[PDB]
From a paper:
Later, our laboratory and others demonstrated that Gram-positive bacteria have orphan NBDs that are able to energize multiple ABC type I sugar importers. Finally, we solve the crystal structure of the B. subtilis multitask ATPase MsmX K43A; the crystals diffracted up to 1.67 Å resolution and based on comparative analysis we hypothesize about sequence and structural features involved in the broader specificity of NBDs. MsmX K43A shares the fold of well-studied NBDs of ABC type I importers.
K43 is involved in ATP coordination and catalysis, interacting with the β- and γ-phosphate groups. The crystal structure was solved at 1.67 Å resolution and the final electron density map allowed to model a detailed refined structure, which comprises all residues of MsmX K43A, except the N-terminus methionine. Interestingly, most crystal structures of NBDs from ABC transporters show a dimer in the asymmetric unit, promoted either by the C-terminal domains or the presence of ATP (or analogs). This is not the case for B. subtilis MsmX, that crystallized as a monomer with one molecule in the asymmetric unit, and very few contacts with symmetry related molecules, as indicated by analyzing the protein interface using PISA server. MsmX N-terminal domain presents the general α/β-type ATPase domain fold, which comprises the RecA-like domain (residues 2–87 and 155–235, in blue) and the α-helical domain (residues 88–154, in yellow). The regulatory C-terminal domain (residues 236–365, in red) forms a mixed barrel with 3 α-helices and 11 β-strands. In the ligand-free MsmX K43A structure here reported, the A-loop length is similar to the one in ATP-bound MalK, already in a conformation that favours nucleotide binding. The MalK F81-Y87 region accommodates the MalF/G helix, providing an hydrophobic environment; in MsmX, the corresponding phenylalanine (F82) is flipped, causing the side chains of Q83 and N84 to point towards the complex interface, which decreases the hydrophobic character of the cleft. Furthermore, in the hydrophobic pocket involved at the interface with the MalF/G, MalK A73 is at 3 Å from the MalF helix, while in MsmX this residue is replaced by K74, which affects considerably the electrostatic potential, the volume and the hydrophobicity of the corresponding pocket.
Residue numbers in the entry: 2 to 367
Write the structure that this text describes.
């Protein structure tokens, strides 16, 4: 289904809204992740969508029908993780069928939908077992079949991995991804975990304090963050940020001076940033081990002291600074590199971003 949120607001007791002008158009088959820190308003928004909470202002549409006034049960939404407990004395089959039985659906049609769900969950050999005979990993899949047999237009998932242990969490995460690949049901998934957002979504809605910060594919949000908060929240280790003073062709950070690409320089000039203090952002992977990288970087190298060098698989995380401004670089593993040495690094200024010092909003050079 297509969903439209048109200028939605939620207010409680205080006159600052908990959700502020939430505007979004979700296409069919998208897996949309709402992500942000504590109090971002994602979970409230999801419950407004479910119809557990009332919309204060604006319109919510499902397939172009305004459903603000429609009761939860009539919205054709499945709250996938609600009433999730299994009946211990019923089979897998019966735990998945239960809601259809209550609905008096004919037995054969029940059978057809149940078997189909079991195949999608990988439970076809287990249909006549009891829950106790399934492992923990298999057992947590069963109640998803209740959502699939419902034949709903949209699935809602509110932070379903948050209370699971590590081993069950990895398996649920994977199950959710598969369920989206096999059924393609339009889904809204709320989390506080930016890695889940990057790896599970078709598109992400980054939220803070009830306000949409950015909407985009995971790659778009990562590569072109709207502001400094998004740049710092998405990615781990997240973007490095520096204060410097822009001149004609150079950004001077502490006692370093990095050449700014002409293309970017032109726009910054035209927007009137020459001679002003600006925030410069650059990802760890875009700070290169200058020795090794095949590319030549034109006057954007510095000598950095290695505070710590941490091997992580085939990469090294380097913790350093430009004067008093800390940064992390993420380079390919090499052996000489040791905590305490010096290392020349080259900033890829084609991947650098500039943000306004007062607004923290990214300055569109693209």
């Amino acid at each position: 289904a297509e969903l439209r949120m048109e200028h939605i607001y939620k207010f409680y007791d205080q006159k600052e809204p908990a959700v502020d002008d939430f505007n979004l158009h979700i296409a069919d088959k998208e897996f949309i992740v709402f992500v942000g820190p504590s109090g971002c308003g994602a979970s409230t928004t999801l419950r407004m969508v479910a119809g557990l909470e009332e919309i204060s202002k604006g319109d919510f549409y499902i397939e172009g029908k305004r459903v603000n006034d429609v009761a939860p049960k009539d919205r054709d939404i499945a709250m996938v993780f609600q009433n999730y407990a299994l009946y211990p004395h019923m089979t897998v089959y019966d735990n998945i069928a239960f809601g259809l039985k209550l609905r008096k659906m004919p037995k054969p049609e029940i059978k057809k939908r149940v078997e189909e769900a079991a195949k999608i969950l990988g439970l076809e050999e287990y249909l006549h077992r009891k829950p106790k005979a399934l492992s923990g990993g298999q057992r947590q899949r069963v109640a998803l079949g209740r959502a699939i047999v419902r034949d709903a237009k949209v699935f809602l998932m509110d932070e379903p991995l948050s209370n699971l242990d590590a081993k069950l969490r990895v398996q649920m995460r994977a199950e959710i991804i598969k369920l989206h690949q096999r059924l393609q049901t339009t889904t809204i998934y709320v989390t506080h975990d930016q890695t889940e957002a990057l790896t599970m979504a078709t598109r992400i809605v980054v939220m803070k304090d009830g306000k949409i910060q950015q909407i985009g594919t995971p790659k778009d949000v990562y590569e072109f963050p709207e502001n400094v908060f998004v740049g710092g929240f998405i990615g781990s280790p997240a973007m490095n940020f520096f204060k410097g003073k822009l001149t004609d062709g150079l950004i001077k950070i502490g006692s370093a001076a990095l050449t700014v690409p002409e293309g970017k320089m032109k726009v910054l000039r035209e927007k009137g940033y020459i001679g002003k203090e600006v925030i410069f952002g650059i990802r760890p992977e875009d700070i290169h081990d200058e020795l090794i990288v095949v590319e030549s970087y034109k006057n954007s190298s510095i000598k950095a002291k290695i505070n710590v060098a941490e091997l992580l698989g085939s990469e090294i995380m380097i913790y350093s600074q430009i004067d008093n401004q800390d940064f992390i670089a993420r380079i390919d593993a090499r052996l000489d590199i040791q905590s305490g040495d010096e290392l020349t690094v080259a900033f890829d200024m084609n991947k650098g971003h500039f943000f306004d010092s007062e607004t923290e909003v990214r300055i569109r050079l693209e």
